[PDB]
Design a protein around this ligand. Sequence first.
Ligand SMILES: Nc1ncnc2c1ncn2[C@@H]1O[C@H](CSCC[C@H](N)C(=O)O)[C@@H](O)[C@H]1O
Ligand SMILES: Nc1ncnc2c1ncn2[C@@H]1O[C@H](CSCC[C@H](N)C(=O)O)[C@@H](O)[C@H]1O
Ligand SMILES: [Mg+2]
Ligand SMILES: [Mg+2]
Lengths: 242, 242
Amino acid sequence: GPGMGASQDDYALIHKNILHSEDLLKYILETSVYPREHEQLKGLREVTEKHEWSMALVAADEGLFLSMLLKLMNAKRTIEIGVYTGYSLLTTALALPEDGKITAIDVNKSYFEIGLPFIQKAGVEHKINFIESEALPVLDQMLQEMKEEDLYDFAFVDADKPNYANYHERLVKLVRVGGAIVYDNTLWYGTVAFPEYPGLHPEEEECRVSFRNLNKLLAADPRVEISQVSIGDGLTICRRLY
Amino acid sequence: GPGMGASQDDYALIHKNILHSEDLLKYILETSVYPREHEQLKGLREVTEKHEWSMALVAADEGLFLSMLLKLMNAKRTIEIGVYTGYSLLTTALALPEDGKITAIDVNKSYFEIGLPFIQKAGVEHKINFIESEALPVLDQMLQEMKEEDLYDFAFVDADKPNYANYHERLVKLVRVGGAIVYDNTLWYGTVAFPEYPGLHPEEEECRVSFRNLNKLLAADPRVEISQVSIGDGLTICRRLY
Ligand SMILES: Nc1ncnc2c1ncn2[C@@H]1O[C@H](CSCC[C@H](N)C(=O)O)[C@@H](O)[C@H]1O
Ligand SMILES: Nc1ncnc2c1ncn2[C@@H]1O[C@H](CSCC[C@H](N)C(=O)O)[C@@H](O)[C@H]1O
Ligand SMILES: [Mg+2]
Ligand SMILES: [Mg+2]
């Protein structure tokens, strides 16, 4: 209700990680990520680390992996669902060719305006069409207007986790055959490994249940082939078969 | 030569995981890997788990990830350095198109012949050219023979870990611009995160030092872009820039 509102300090999982030690994660970041991180990504990460919802920020080592994937598959047109301050968005725009185009959807443009000066300084604002909306209505409108030639090469889904299964039903039609859909956080701090997990914030417990259901659904879905990857907070890559 | 025993039972790190939870790794395998693992991959894995050198077997979740990379980048010609019983080789052969081609190099053909019946039942043996040799003389001969039009799309390096840096100097010339080189085990059970790590077999300590040196070298190498991925025992994806 009325008060000071939602704080990430109310959340039980903010200090969890899927790797064995903080020392290993820190080693990966210092050895293999920070020396390869664009200066504007560094700046955007450092301001977002001070933001009240910093727990949502995509991991920097995951960012370099998404960039690698985009280049290896020669992605040109992508969609991002869940922008926040724009780290994965800027990662994607930097990875695409000069003529690459991104459709970026988030309910809260004020987060995006935190990253926008870094995006602009990186010279890649022209690649981004930002839509301030709930993603589901936008995706449903796209299904009525987009033609086969307009299909996306790549989708990154990092928005409200309980809705991933709903996003999936749209994105297997909006991503081209052979294209990729990447769902972020599908290991949810390791909590998905347990049928019951004590002491979670109600929103954290909802996401544990939804990800346990989503992970089973994707593994059974004959429209895609999958790879769940233990990077960041876990992600699942889906490649559309038909 | 004469010295101390170096069988798998002599190693210290065999049971150590880079993920913090045995339950989490089991969850990934049971939920997202086994339901998507080819029947002949399952059979090949089950035999290899009983083998004298089972610690060297590539992780099954890493297998699905390598398959996804191969499909997303439309790889057609690849090279594997380090075959063992052939799990990553069969993964690769199943991923490639019908007319794909793999050059597979290993010093020990008897290991490969353990997995060969599974590769044959999968119907993809025809894609594989197995070369029984140390890899370095083969790569040096390839440098003298390979034309630009025959450069490999993809290279998987999983053989003798101290030699990775030597393999790299050849493979950045044998893989096409924009092609990928994947080095396996670059987190080495997490021991790379520490300047000193007590309790290791001398060969385990040698790999810890070599990977710490390799991880710095790749992070600084202008010929490639990199992504180190905390999957399996860690891997580093390199994409050749020029
Ligand atoms: N229904 C919805 N539709 C679109 N965006 C939503 C949404 N519900 C939540 N979001 C947004 O999804 C974002 C999740 S955080 C995303 C992190 C970002 N991709 C990064 O790289 O760091 C938040 O910004 C939130 O505002
Ligand atoms: N110098 C060398 N040249 C080529 N292969 C070598 C080598 N030294 C060791 N090897 C081989 O490298 C292999 C490493 S284990 C490889 C694992 C396999 N790729 C999998 O998917 O499970 C062993 O089979 C070993 O025989
Ligand atoms: Mg996320
Ligand atoms: Mg290996």
